[PDB]
Amino acid sequence: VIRGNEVSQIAPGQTGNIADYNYKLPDDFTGCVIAWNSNKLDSKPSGNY
Amino acid sequence: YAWNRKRISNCVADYSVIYNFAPFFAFKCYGVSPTKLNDLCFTNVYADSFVIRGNEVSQIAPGQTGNIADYNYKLPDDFTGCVIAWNSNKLDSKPSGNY
Amino acid sequence: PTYGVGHQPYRVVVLSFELLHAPATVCGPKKSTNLVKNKCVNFNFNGLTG
Numbered sequence: 054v055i056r057g058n059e060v061s062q063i064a065p066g067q068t069g070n071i072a073d074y075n076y077k078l079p080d081d082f083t084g085c086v087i088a089w090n091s092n093k094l095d096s097k098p099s100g101n102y
Numbered sequence: 103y104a105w106n107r108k109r110i111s112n113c114v115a116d117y118s119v120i121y122n123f124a125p126f127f128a129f130k131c132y133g134v135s136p137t138k139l140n141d142l143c144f145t146n147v148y149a150d151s152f153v154i155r156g157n158e159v160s161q162i163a164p165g166q167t168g169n170i171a172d173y174n175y176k177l178p179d180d181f182t183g184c185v186i187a188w189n190s191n192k193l194d195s196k197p198s199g200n201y
Numbered sequence: 202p203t204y205g206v207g208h209q210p211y212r213v214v215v216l217s218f219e220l221l222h223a224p225a226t227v228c229g230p231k232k233s234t235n236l237v238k239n240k241c242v243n244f245n246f247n248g249l250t251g
């Protein structure tokens with residue numbers, strides 16, 4: 054589960070914060086990336102920590 | 103029709119805090135890439151800020167006509183830069199209408 | 202929940218396929234056909250045609 058600003062970092066040949074320190078994809082990657090919003094399930098009014 | 107222009111010069115620019123400042127989706131750049139902005143550098147950076155309708159966000163592009171792009175804000179064909187747009191329904195919307 | 206649309210949580214599932222070098226263990230729904238020989242036919246062996 055990532056933030057909405059960093060969905061584009063899950064791609065071959067990307068840098069930033071997730072793609073450098075958390076989850077890096079190879080340059081010759083074949084496959085599919087599926088992302089959907091989960092505001093109803095993964096958020097709290099007091100803050101999901 | 104009266105968009106502001108701010109000159110950014112004589113400083114060190116960090117482009118990673120732009121994502122923390124505003125909740126936008128795409129850092130849509132044209133002459134450069136958003137991930138390579140922190141390595142190389144420029145002479146001067148100008149920031150233009152305005153509010154439009156969601157129909158006319160696509161008109162902010164080099165080489166395109168319309169209503170905003172012809173009479174309000176025209177971009178050159180040799181435009182090198184990034185366009186950052188995000189929704190403003192919580193600050194720029196009223197039930198009685200905005201004038 | 203009061204954040205902007207760019208700060209919302211996003212569930213990400215990445216499916217990572219590898220191209221066929223070993224014998225295939227996962228294959229989609231396709232009914233097999235009895236093998237013929239010594240005839241100019243169209244074949245489909247584990248996803249490659251010809």
Ligand SMILES: *[C@@H]1O[C@H](CO)[C@@H](O)[C@H](O)[C@H]1NC(C)=O
Pocket residue numbers: 122123
């Ligand atoms: C914008 O500036 C105001 C005034 O300094 C501050 O209260 C607010 O938290 C700032 N917004 C962000 C997202 O930092």
